[PDB]
Amino acid sequence: VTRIERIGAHSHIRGLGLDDALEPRQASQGMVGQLAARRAAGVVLEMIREGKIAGRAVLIAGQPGTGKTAIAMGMAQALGPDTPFTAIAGSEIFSLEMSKTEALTQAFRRSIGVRIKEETEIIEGEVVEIQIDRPATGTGSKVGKLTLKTTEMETIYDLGTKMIESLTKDKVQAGDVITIDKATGKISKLGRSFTRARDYDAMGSQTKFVQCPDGELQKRKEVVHTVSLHEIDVINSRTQGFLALFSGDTGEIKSEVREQINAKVAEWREEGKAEIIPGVLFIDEVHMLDIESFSFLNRALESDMAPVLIMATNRGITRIRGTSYQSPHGIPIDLLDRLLIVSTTPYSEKDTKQILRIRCEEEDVEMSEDAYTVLTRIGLETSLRYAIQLITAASLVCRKRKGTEVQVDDIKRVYSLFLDESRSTQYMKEYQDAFLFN
């Protein structure tokens, strides 16, 4: 069965593939080559993990198809789910609901996580017998008694009215393994230790059982709650903020709310209530930001709640959007002075062949050596992405003719069927008048 996540462009990248000294291996964790850029990415990753310096900016710049987004995905996979990683495109900040500065602020504050750790008393056991006595008619005080069992304990609890109501709402029966939090009174059923009586009808197919919990009844467990700054801002902006967390529609959050939240989070950090988990914001194709967005970035990186900012761009000296000024990478020099630039070099023949081999391994495609040579030649002549696509195309063509290994004939067939940019442009020049404009 196929999960919602399938083989994508960067599905083979499991990390930067570095050793302890941040020295890049030639081929490890999907990454091949780009040794200097991977070493720089590892240094940046260590800086992120340390989480002590706020508002650091790194720019991964290089020619198209050199692995900028691959390096970003490797950094994201090496960080792990514990550290926030907000990946957005540059075009996403242009929104009809909010200003560009508001979108950038929300992107920054989605990359900082606030973690609250507290210890609570927890009762987890198998329900042996539950008895609830209620008045037949009219308002009255329900009286009840509950018996819970573990492998080494069994205690009979006298129940109050609100716990009676909670148990009634949850429909707790005998044999249900339930968890009760003493403070909030929340009850969560986590399984049935055995089946219900067979003589009952309209009950459905009984599922699998759950082994009874061991140890003491009333334990003490550590509960961890982690939210981002953006979630706090949204739920504090208005009453319907919890719904705005999912529908968007947050509008523009007042600066007063954000200042208060920053102060409160600082107070929690000083008092040891909460820990701040700085993350990364990755803006792919940062050249689509305009001058106002860059100017906002300039001073927004100077806050102590700012995350590490990583940008990727493949532009040379290009006009800055919203202006008539040519600048390196499409970025104003004032922002370029605030950031370290990581250059990506073009790939050689052996690096291209190794990338093709890793892609074929990821896609479960078996290819011959001659086919690998031809595909590497095509990738060097045309582009890496075209060869990557021809991998799957030739796999399908080979499977159509009831084969098992992708041969040179299949690669030639898919090369004939599907065109790259260069051959398409040539054929369009051959029939220039037929196409509509220019």
Partner: protein, 433 residues
């Protein structure tokens, strides 16, 4: 605490005569600029002039924002300091002039004395009195008192599910009823009650506490423009149906001004004029500058500090009108210009050393000299930003201090703007656009 870009700036480093010490309070040069900023700080502390504008002008990396934050630190946390970027006036909800006015009112603070009336105790009687009022009996460790409360308070008590035996907190000013828990004396009756218990209050049933509240004029304007203090259905409806910002009228601001003047006359309020800081002023358009003319001419406005690194540049919103700082000459006539200069290599070394000490990094003299040389070319910002990666490299190699080899390795790994520009120029045909 995380270390930010200006975490070492603690003050202006001025002596008693107003002259600028060379290296003090995390500042290394800009003695003339620091003396001017000290004069501006004294002006803000005088609380006499209104709408006096100052422009910090100079190339990037010359510590204009550092000087603004140093002014903020010199003033103290009591004096409001609102930092805003020029790009923030372009909201999709309200007009740009409204944003400017809101930040102007945000810069003016008000310290007002308030008395809180508190009913705190364990509920012993909750008897409705037919719209139905409530008669409530509260007991503490010091006594018992019976109170008659409004039907809104009764509705709040019902919403809090307050029953006989619960410890409650009532604020008489806002009518805010909070149920804290079932009294501790009943914590033994059951074994599983699904309740949070709270001890009996040990003071009196009725308490009056006087506190000092720190508010701004903008807060009063917002409270009076999108009211939520009535606790009626209409307030909730207005909050839910109209959540966006609105263009507050001059009439509301005049009424709020009258209210604040009345409070000050009564002796229960103190005014703190405060400061507004606009960092990227060149990002404003001609309409914003034209509005700022009248806004600065106002007798209510705060002291505004502007910053700009632009040269002879076209003003935004105009076709081809070019002005010395991106600021039209009319507004430049209304500002006092503080000029910041580029730093000498000695000052660059001093700033690098201060930043290294701030980030908890030990750097050798040879490494410090090499990094200052790297900063002589490229920029000071680039040289400063190599400190943490070099520390990480030294830690990886087992060294507790940065040597010259680590700085060289980091500089090889990470390019600066000029080196990347050279690479782009050499390979213009390979990059897009």
């Amino acid at each position: 605490q995380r270390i930010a870009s200006h975490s070492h700036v603690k003050g202006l480093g001025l002596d008693e005569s107003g002259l600028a010490k060379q290296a003090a309070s995390g500042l290394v040069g800009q003695e003339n600029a620091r003396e001017a900023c000290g004069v501006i700080v004294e002006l803000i502390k005088s609380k006499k002039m209104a709408g006096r504008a100052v422009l910090l002008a100079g190339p990037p990396g010359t510590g204009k924002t550092a000087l603004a934050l140093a002014i903020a630190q010199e003033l103290g946390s009591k004096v409001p300091f609102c930092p805003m970027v020029g790009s923030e006036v372009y909201s999709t909800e309200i007009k740009k002039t409204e944003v400017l006015m809101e930040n102007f009112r945000r810069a003016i603070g008000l310290r007002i004395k308030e008395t809180k009336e508190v009913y705190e105790g364990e509920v012993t009687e909750l008897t409705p009195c037919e719209i139905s009022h409530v008669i409530i009996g509260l007991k503490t460790a010091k006594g018992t008192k019976q109170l008659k409360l409004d039907p809104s308070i009764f509705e709040s008590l019902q919403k809090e599910r307050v029953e006989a035996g619960d410890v409650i907190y009532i604020e008489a000013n806002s009518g805010a009823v909070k149920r804290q828990g079932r009294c501790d004396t009943y914590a033994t009756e059951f074994d599983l009650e699904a309740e949070e218990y709270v001890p009996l209050p040990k003071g009196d049933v009725h308490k009056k506490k006087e506190i000092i509240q720190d508010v701004t004029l903008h807060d009063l304007d917002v409270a009076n423009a999108r009211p939520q203090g009535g606790q009626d259905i209409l307030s909730m409806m207005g909050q839910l149906m109209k959540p966006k910002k609105t263009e507050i009228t001059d009439k509301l601001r005049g009424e709020i001004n009258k209210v604040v003047n009345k409070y000050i006359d009564q002796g229960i309020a103190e005014l703190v004029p405060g400061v507004l800081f606009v960092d990227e002023v060149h990002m404003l358009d001609i309409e914003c500058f034209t509005y700022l003319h009248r806004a600065l001419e106002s007798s209510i406005a705060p002291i505004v500090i502007f910053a700009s690194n632009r040269g002879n540049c076209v003003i935004r919103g105009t076709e081809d009108i070019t002005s010395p700082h991106g600021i039209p000459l009319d507004l430049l006539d209304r500002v006092m210009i503080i000029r910041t200069m580029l730093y000498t290599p000695q000052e660059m070394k001093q700033i690098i050393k201060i930043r290294a000490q701030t980030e908890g990094i030990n750097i050798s003299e040879e490494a410090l000299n090499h990094l200052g040389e790297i900063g002589t070319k490229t920029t000071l910002r680039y040289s400063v930003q190599l400190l943490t990666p070099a520390n990480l490299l030294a830690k990886i190699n087992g060294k507790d201090s940065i040597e010259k080899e680590h700085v060289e390795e980091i500089s090889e790994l990470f390019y600066d703007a000029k080196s990347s520009a050279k690479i782009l120029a050499d390979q213009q045909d390979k990059y897009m656009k």
